[PDB]
Amino acid sequence: IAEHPVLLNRAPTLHRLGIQAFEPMLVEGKAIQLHPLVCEAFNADFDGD
Partner 1 sequence: NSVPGAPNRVSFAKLREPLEVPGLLDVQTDSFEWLIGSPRWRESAAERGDVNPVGGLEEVLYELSPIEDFSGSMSLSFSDPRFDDVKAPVDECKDKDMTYAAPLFVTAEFINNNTGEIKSQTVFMGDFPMMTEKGTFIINGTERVVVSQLVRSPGVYFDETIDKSTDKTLHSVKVIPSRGAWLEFDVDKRDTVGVRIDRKRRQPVTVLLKALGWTSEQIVERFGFSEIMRSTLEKDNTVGTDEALLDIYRKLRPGEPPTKESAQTLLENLFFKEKRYDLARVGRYKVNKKLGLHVGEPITSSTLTEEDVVATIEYLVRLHEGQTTMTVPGGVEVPVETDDIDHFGNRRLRTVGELIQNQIRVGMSRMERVVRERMTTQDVEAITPQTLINIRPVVAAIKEFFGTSQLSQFMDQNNPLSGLTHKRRLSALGPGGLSRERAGLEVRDVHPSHYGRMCPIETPEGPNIGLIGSLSVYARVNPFGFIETPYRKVVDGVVSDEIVYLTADEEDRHVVAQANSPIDADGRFVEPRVLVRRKAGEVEYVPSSEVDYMDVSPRQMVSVATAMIPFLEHDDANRALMGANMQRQAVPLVRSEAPLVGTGMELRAAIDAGDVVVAEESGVIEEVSADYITVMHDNGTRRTYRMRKFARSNHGTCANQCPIVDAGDRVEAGQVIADGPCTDDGEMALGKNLLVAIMPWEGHNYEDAIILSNRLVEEDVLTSIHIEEHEIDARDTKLGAEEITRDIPNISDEVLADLDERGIVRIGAEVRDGDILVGKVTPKGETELTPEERLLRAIFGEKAREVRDTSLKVPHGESGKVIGIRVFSREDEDELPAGVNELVRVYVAQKRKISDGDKLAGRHGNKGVIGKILPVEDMPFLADGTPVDIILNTHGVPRRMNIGQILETHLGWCAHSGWKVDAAKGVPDWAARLPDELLEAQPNAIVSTPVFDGAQEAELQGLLSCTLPNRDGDVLVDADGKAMLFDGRSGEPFPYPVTVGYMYIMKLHHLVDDKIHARSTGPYSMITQQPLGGKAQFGGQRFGEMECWAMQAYGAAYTLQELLTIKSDDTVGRVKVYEAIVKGENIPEPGIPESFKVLLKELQSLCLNVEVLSS
Partner 2 sequence: KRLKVVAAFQQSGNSPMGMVLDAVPVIPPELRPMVQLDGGRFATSDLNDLYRRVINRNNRLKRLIDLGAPEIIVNNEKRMLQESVDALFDNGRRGRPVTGPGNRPLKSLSDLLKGKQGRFRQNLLGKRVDYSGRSVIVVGPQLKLHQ
Partner DNA sequence: AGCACAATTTAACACTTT
Partner DNA sequence: AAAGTGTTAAATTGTGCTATAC
Binding-site residues for Mg(2+), in ranges, read 45, 47, 49
Taking the mean position of all CA atoms in its chain, how far away is CA 37? 11
Per-residue binding string, DNA, 3-22, x by CB under 7 A, is --------xx----------
Q: Using an 8 Å Cβ cutoff, are 32 and 3 in contact?
A: no
* DSSP assignment letter at 30: S
Site mask for partner 1 (CB under 8 A), range 12-31, x = bound = xxxxxxxx---------xxx
Handedness of CA 2, 25, 29, 35 (dihedral sign): negative
> What is the nearest approach in angstroms of DNA to the Cβ of residue 13?
8
Residues in contact with partner 1 by CB under 8 A are 7, 9, 11-19, 29-31, 36, 39, 45-48
